């Protein structure tokens, strides 16, 4: 028929519409798509709020300058978004909240650009701090970087500060930040944004976790790990740079037992 | 209907070509992974594929049983000035290498934990003594109950607290466990801390390890002598082999790269490299 | 109240019945009351690969091509 | 039947329970109650965000001390909450925002106490500012007292600093604050707490208003104003004191147009 | 004169029968002629807490006033 060519999209949850051109046709998590709690495997009585349109909409983050020496970007979703606005306020307010997710990674260059951009949204992420002395003792301020995310590194750097330490994660690149191999990584719901085709990656994910619903402020689900696959080159020239720029979208939402607001010491 | 001890797909028949479909082009951005079969990259004959992944099942991947910990417990002489050793083992898988990195393929997972014991034992000192078929008490310490104080208390006395008493040289001691989980599945991930921090309060009142969930999930074990102190010490070893029976596995995720280290997923350096040497251009 | 099933014998001589004839069947009984005591069943099934392999907001015809 | 005399209450909006047992038999503004807004009559054109439980429920504002000096007290409704929970987030997070209400004024003394408590709930209640020179010129900082409210005054005290104003409203309490006599105030929809009989008064007031959902942290709609008809007294005692506390609770309230946050100056 | 019942499983995997359909039994057989040595059967019951929580010499409606 017409030109509804995969190539084209026009997602709008919410008040908020994208409209990529370039779009290699979407990937939905694991089949599941997002949806709400089903009463058959509900958990906490009350009546669960839902702020529909006020938070389901399309949030941008920040954008990352991407360059040669360039290693990588991290973002811990459920916390990710914690400001953006009423899913910022739900969010703390109650001690439960089941969220989905619709991560549109964008990300475009001229046909003169190369480089590929493993988008890699992986559950449950728990990435590796950097002490070699005490394991785990990666402090929370730090462990949740919000709207900025953090970044991969080129190879480890043990912290040896220690009549206090700097408890931060120090996640190598090639084990995917959890000690595990980046080319075995496209096992995780996933799309590779390939400078010369699609200039964006759109990753529908469905709350994942195993409890029903679960808290937010405390526990993280899915977290996005963007990383260059293949290097960014140009023409002879000293370095080159493109602005990946991610926009995330709570969908199918709800939160459990209102109370006073949350004021967690992220400073 | 499709059970694991099925056929593979027989392989269909395939002539020449010169269509304009394209089956071997894929474009990997879609994530998707052309399913292609080996009768379109050249000409098939029709084999009748008799193979089955029978044995590859998540149920068959876990059918061996592991063993999760080794316990060192001693009945000394009654004269002894030291106290009388009974060990006490948390339960937690992650102590061994082996099932553990079976195990954390999978971000989640709902199994019955089915704990064998194989106990073994030996005279510690060159004195040459006898000692009577000993028998072993493997109290089972349910999260949050009282962990034994001294070899011989009342905690002891089980009155609520699955236990077993192995006789020394036997058929070696079994108990079946149904998930015990709090949630609906064991984490074998856990993302996210179990205290937040709150700005009106102390840095330390509200701290916390990251990863960490409950304080004890599975439980502890506590294993005696039963005996008493008789004058040949006899030092014994209680391994434990845990085999997850009625399994289930949740998110594929990519298997351990470089060496464990401790029970938080973070890894010691040196041992940050895996891979090994060959020439991008040598068979 | 047995639980008789069919073995997957792979056809072997005298072993009850092959390439002469019949099946192989096994008796099984659960014993205790608590169903996490029961033998590992291995009568276990198999999904297709596609909520991994072929997981998009559309559908893949392998013939077409791959980015429309 | 049973004692379901209408002297015991037990309203529930949202996951709060007020349980009343002097209760005067509750009125409901003009027989109309509140409602969510019938497409028949609707205007703004997107979807329509409704907090439901999230705000819906009661929430107590801050208590007031009743004197013999005392001389009554005001609150602005729609504002008067702008802070309770997220009723107070999604407040300034749209341009419009029509909401119903249900506010039960507690108060209960002891059976030898004595004095009428006139709660009138009066839609748009423009009280009268304090500069005999210019009029109207009353400053929002001070027009919205919020969480806290105003109070009545005595007599009228002319505001004279001139080189730059104390701009506050000087209701005066015979006139209902508005210039309007308060005998004749028992004309919208009230409930007088006579300390003898029941202790306590409850109003469900619809949205009222010229316009089908208006604005909030702009428009005021209805507005509180407790005033002692009957004066306290006790025994023979210098000054006796009991203690007025209102609850209010935002029912079927919607909102429309999210944006950035609204910060108004209220300091 | 086998003592078939009903095991209560928790719909696992390859247990027998679940999410894929079917139920699960396990056989008993008193063996001594003394009932005091049969196995303690675990299919007890549940009263209403009633004869404790409710105790009253006349009836007592929820959405009532206690002390009428």
Chains 1, 4 share one sequence.
Request: with cysteine; net charge neutral; charged share 15%.
């Amino acid at each position: 028929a017409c030109g509804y060519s995969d190539r084209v999209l026009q997602l709008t949850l919410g008040n908020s519409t994208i409209t990529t051109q370039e779009a290699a046709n979407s990937v939905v998590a694991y089949g599941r798509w997002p949806e709400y709690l089903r009463d058959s495997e509900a958990n906490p009585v009350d009546q669960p709020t839902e702020p529909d349109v006020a938070a389901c909409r399309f949030y941008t983050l920040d954008t990352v300058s991407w360059t040669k020496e360039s290693r990588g970007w991290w973002w811990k979703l459920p916390d990710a978004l914690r400001d953006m606005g009423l899913f910022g306020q739900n969010m703390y307010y109650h001690y439960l909240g089941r969220s989905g997710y619709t991560v549109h990674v964008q990300c475009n260059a001229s046909k003169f650009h190369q480089g590929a951009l493993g988008v890699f949204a992986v559950p449950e992420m728990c990435l590796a701090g950097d002490s070699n002395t005490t394991t785990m003792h990666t402090s929370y301020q730090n462990a949740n970087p919000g709207e900025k995310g953090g970044t991969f590194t080129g190879t480890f750097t043990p912290d040896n500060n220690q009549t206090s330490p700097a408890r931060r994660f120090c996640p190598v690149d090639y084990l995917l930040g959890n000690g595990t191999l980046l080319g075995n990584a496209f096992v995780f719901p996933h799309q590779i944004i390939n400078l010369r085709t699609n200039n964006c990656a759109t990753l529908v994910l469905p709350y994942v976790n195993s409890l029903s619903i679960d808290s937010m402020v405390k526990h993280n689900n899915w977290g996005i790990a963007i990383l260059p696959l293949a290097p960014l080159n140009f023409a002879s020239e000293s370095s080159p740079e493109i602005p990946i720029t991610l926009t995330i979208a709570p969908m199918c939402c709800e939160f459990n037992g209102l109370r006073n607001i949350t004021l967690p010491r992220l400073q | 209907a499709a059970t694991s001890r099925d056929a593979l797909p027989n392989t269909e028949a395939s002539g020449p070509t010169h269509s304009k479909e394209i089956p071997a082009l894929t474009a990997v951005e879609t994530g998707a992974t052309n399913p292609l079969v080996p009768s379109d990259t050249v000409q098939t004959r029709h084999v009748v594929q008799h193979r089955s992944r029978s044995e590859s099942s998540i149920e068959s991947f876990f059918a061996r049983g592991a063993c999760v910990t080794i316990m060192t417990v001693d009945n000394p002489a009654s004269t002894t000035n030291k106290d009388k050793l009974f060990a006490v083992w948390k339960i937690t898988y992650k102590d061994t290498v082996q099932l553990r990195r079976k195990l954390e393929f999978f971000t989640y997972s709902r199994f019955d934990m089915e704990l064998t014991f194989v106990v073994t034992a030996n005279f510690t000192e060159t004195n040459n003594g006898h000692a009577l078929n000993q028998v072993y008490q493997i109290m089972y310490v349910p999260p949050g109950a009282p962990v034994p104080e001294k070899w011989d208390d009342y905690t002891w006395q089980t009155s609520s607290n699955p236990s077993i008493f192995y006789t020394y040289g036997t058929a070696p001691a079994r108990i079946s466990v149904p998930y015990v989980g709090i949630s609906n599945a064991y984490s074998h991930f856990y993302d996210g801390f179990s205290k937040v921090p709150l700005k009106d309060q102390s840095a330390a009142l509200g701290d916390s390890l990251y990863g960490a969930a409950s304080l004890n999930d599975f439980g502890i074990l506590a294993v005696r002598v039963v005996n008493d102190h008789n004058p040949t010490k006899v030092t014994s070893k209680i391994r434990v082999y845990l085999k997850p029976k009625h399994i289930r596995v949740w998110c594929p995720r990519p298997p351990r790269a470089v060496a464990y280290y401790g029970p938080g997923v973070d890894y010691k350096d040196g041992t940050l490299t895996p891979l090994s040497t060959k020439d991008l251009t040598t068979y | 109240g047995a639980q008789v099933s069919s073995q997957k014998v792979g056809a072997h001589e005298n072993s009850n019945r092959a390439y002469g004839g019949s099946t192989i069947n096994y008796t099984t009984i659960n014993y205790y009351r608590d169903s996490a005591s029961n033998a590992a069943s291995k009568q276990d099934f198999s999904q297709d690969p596609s909520k991994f392999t072929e997981p998009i907001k559309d559908v893949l015809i392998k013939t077409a091509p791959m980015l429309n």
